[PDB]
Every structure is written in structure tokens, then in C-alpha cells.
């Protein structure tokens, strides 16, 4: 049953599984003080008596893996790479590492020192680890752990992050994209409520592949949940498309401007129906960002798009592939 099985000691070592399973276990120097037999196997979900429970839009995105010896404690983190088979990109849904100590309860896996610290974690090892970006394209998740639980598995779910804003007001920023901000004035909401400001970056390489040089784009910014009215106008700040930061084609105000503000109001997980709302609200430019207001939660999307009549068509082609 073992996809990987090898001896390692204080000097560390690694092993890949067959190209059909894509597992990789990397045990850095100094993590394993005594000689130990590192193994990994797949676990059929039928054999679990209590499989991970799943809400409506949650699913397992990888094989369940049992790393051996179970309960192995390491002196500093080790690395496991596992392919995933999620049917989506990084918009409304996220991938998370789950673990089960004995197969009965499933909880999110914690790592105190993650991707930022990879160079330290390798402890001078002569191996390469790909970047997040390369891992994303190859559809591989990297697990950083100081121990082997009975099971690990990757889960797809709706993004769980949120902040609470009340009638006193406040601001939200995004986890991933730093300049994306929303400002809620004093009576925007009547009571204390969960909100997210969800910024999805748009990679140049994908825009270039699908659209060439016909347009660039800002990140997509969604105020969640959608289908809510605000009682005061909420202030949004979105970073400009890269080609506008560099040199704007025009003043970017009123109606014929090639800087288009797109909006989608519909509900649904990774659903959008884009409308060009350029010059129905006023945009103010500063610190490489556009600033405008909305009375409704929605998706917003800026595009520097000279052929202005094609902006919605381009956004649609692009969004389907994000």
C-alpha cells in the first residue's frame, strides 16, 4: 500500500511517489534526530467510519493521506506536497489543510511558521522547493507540519474569513491584496454583521494568454455577502490596472475613457454577470488606486480597455478562466 517508504536520519532526505500520485515528502536536516522509516499511503474514504463532514459547497480536493510512523514528532517542520483536484480557482472558494488525530474529528491544520519561513525550514538542505506560484500552476498543495497525525486531507470550501462592522462604522481590508480597502461610514449597517472584502489578483500571464495586449485589469474586489443594501454609501478603494498606473491613456473621467469600471451584482459561488457602469459614479484617483462609492454589495473590476465596447466581453472570457 505504501506510495513512499524510505529511511532518513539527522542528515535528512526526501522521496517522491510515482508520477501518478505526485506525493513528495521532504524531511530536512536536523528534524529527525534518530534513524526513522518515513512512509505515506492513500486512504479510501469508505474505510473512514467518520469521514470529514461537509457543508453544501464543501468537498475533498485531494486524496486522504496517512503519514508514517503515525504520531511522529519532528524537531522542526517537515514538508509534504500533495496534488489536488479542485474544480475551481481562487475566488469565492479556498483550499485548506485538514487533519484528524484518530479518524473521528477533523480540524484545520495549524502551522506557526509557514511559507514565509521556507528557507529557514530547509535547514541548509540541498533540495529545491518550488514557489507558491509554481505550485498553484501544477495544482499541488504544500503541507508544513511538525508532526504526523493519522490523516491529512485538502478541503475545498467557501472562504471563511470575515470581519465584524457595526453601526459605529469601520474599515475592511483584504488578506491577499494590500491597497484594497472598503470604508463604512457611521450608519451603513443597522446592526453588527459579518463582512468580507475579497480581492482576487489577476495574473498577467493569463490575461496575456487569453486577451494579448488588448486590456489589463485590476484585482476583482467583492463585498460579501452580495445582495445587501447599505443605508449609507460605502467607500471602495481598488488598485488601478497596471497599464494605467504606468501612464494613463486619458484623464479617466466621464464616459469615453478607456478605464472602465465593471460591476456584477448577482449571487452565486463564482458567478458573475458583468455590466459596465463607467460614468454612473465618480472615480477619484490617488496612490495608484481608484476611489468610488456603492450602496450595494457586489463585485467590482477595473479594466484599462481601449476598445471600450468589448470590455464586458473580455471580462467575461477572462472571469470564466480565473
The window from 5-13, 87-95, 182-190, 210-218 that contacts Na ion (CB under 5 A) reads: 87-95
The window from 86-94, 165-173, 266-274, 275-283 that contacts Na ion (CB under 5 A) reads: 86-94
Indicate whether 228 belongs to the interface with Na ion (CB under 5 A): no
C-beta contacts of 197-201 below 8 A and 24+ residues apart: 197/172, 197/173, 197/221, 197/222, 197/223, 197/224, 198/91, 198/92, 198/159, 198/174, 198/222, 198/223, 198/224, 199/174, 199/175, 200/90, 200/91, 200/176, 200/322, 201/176, 201/177
Indicate whether 139 belongs to the interface with Na ion (CB under 5 A): no
Indicate whether 136 belongs to the interface with Na ion (CB under 5 A): no
- In the complex with Na ion, the residue whose CB is nearer, 40 or 177, is 177
Distances (CA, A) of 195 to 14, 170, 174, 182, 190: 43, 11, 11, 11, 14
200 closest CA partner among 88, 87, 317, 82: 88
Total residues contacting Na ion (rule CB under 5 A)? 2
Q: Which of 30, 88, 90, 109 is the binder for Na ion (CB under 5 A)?
A: 90
> Which residues, 275 to 314, sit near Na ion by CB under 5 A?
none
The window from 88-96, 148-156, 220-228, 254-262 that contacts Na ion (CB under 5 A) reads: 88-96
Q: Which of 58, 94, 147, 276 is the binder for Na ion (CB under 5 A)?
A: 94
Distances (CA, A) of 239 to 180, 201, 304, 317: 7, 10, 12, 21
Query: Minimum distance between the CB of residue 94 and Na ion, rounded to whole angstroms?
Result: 4
- In the complex with Na ion, the residue whose CB is nearer, 90 or 109, is 90
- In the complex with Na ion, the residue whose CB is nearer, 90 or 232, is 90
Indicate whether 58 belongs to the interface with Na ion (CB under 5 A): no
Indicate whether 232 belongs to the interface with Na ion (CB under 5 A): no
- In the complex with Na ion, the residue whose CB is nearer, 196 or 236, is 196
Residue 216 CA to residue 207 CA, distance in Å, equals 7
The window from 69-77, 82-90, 101-109, 264-272 that contacts Na ion (CB under 5 A) reads: 82-90
For residues 26 and 48, the answer to whether their CB atoms sit within 8 Å is no
Indicate whether 270 belongs to the interface with Na ion (CB under 5 A): no
Query: Minimum distance between the CB of residue 59 and Na ion, rounded to whole angstroms?
Result: 15
Q: What is the DSSP letter of 281?
A: B
Q: Which residues bind Na ion (CB under 5 A)?
A: 90, 94
Amino acid at each position: 500500500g505504501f506510495l513512499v517508504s524510505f529511511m532518513v536520519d539527522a542528515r535528512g532526505g526526501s522521496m517522491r511517489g510515482s508520477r501518478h500520485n505526485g506525493l513528495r515528502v521532504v524531511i530536512p536536516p536536523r528534524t529527525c534526530a534518530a534513524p526513522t522509516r518515513i512512509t505515506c499511503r492513500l486512504v479510501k474514504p469508505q474505510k473512514l467510519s467518520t469521514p470529514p463532514p461537509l457543508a453544501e459547497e464543501e468537498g475533498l480536493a485531494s486524496r486522504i493521506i496517512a503519514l508514517g510512523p503515525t504520531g511522529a514528532q519532528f524537531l522542526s517542520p517537515v514538508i509534504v506536497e500533495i496534488p489536488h483536484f479542485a474544480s475551481h480557482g481562487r475566488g469565492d472558494r479556498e483550499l485548506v489543510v485538514l487533519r484528524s488525530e484518530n479518524g473521528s474529528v477533523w480540524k484545520e491544520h495549524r502551522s506557526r511558521y509557514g511559507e514565509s519561513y521556507l528557507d529557514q525550514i530547509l535547514n541548509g538542505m540541498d533540495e529545491e522547493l518550488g514557489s507558491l506560484e509554481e505550485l498553484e500552476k501544477k495544482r499541488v498543495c504544500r503541507i508544513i507540519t511538525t508532526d504526523f497525525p493519522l490523516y491529512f486531507v485538502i478541503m475545498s470550501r467557501l472562504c471563511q474569513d470575515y470581519d465584524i462592522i457595526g453601526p459605529e462604522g469601520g474599515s475592511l481590508k483584504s488578506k491577499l491584496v494590500p491597497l484594497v480597502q472598503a470604508t463604512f461610514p457611521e450608519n451603513a449597517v443597522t446592526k453588527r454583521v459579518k463582512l468580507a472584502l475579497q480581492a482576487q489578483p489577476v495574473p498577467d500571464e493569463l490575461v496575456t494568454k487569453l486577451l494579448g495586449n488588448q486590456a489589463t485589469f485590476s484585482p476583482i474586489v467583492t463585498v460579501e455577502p452580495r445582495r445587501r443594501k447599505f443605508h449609507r454609501p460605502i467607500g471602495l478603494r481598488i488598485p488601478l490596472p497596471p497599464s494605467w498606473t504606468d501612464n494613463p491613456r486619458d484623464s479617466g473621467e466621464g464616459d469615453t475613457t478607456s478605464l472602465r469600471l465593471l460591476c456584477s451584482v448577482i449571487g452565486g459561488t463564482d458567478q458573475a454577470q458583468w455590466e459596465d457602469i463607467t460614468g454612473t459614479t465618480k472615480l477619484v484617483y490617488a496612490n495608484e488606486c481608484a476611489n468610488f462609492t456603492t450602496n450595494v454589495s457586489a463585485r467590482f473590476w477595473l479594466s484599462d480597455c481601449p476598445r471600450t465596447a468589448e470590455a464586458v466581453n473580455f471580462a467575461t472570457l477572462l472571469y470564466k478562466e480565473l
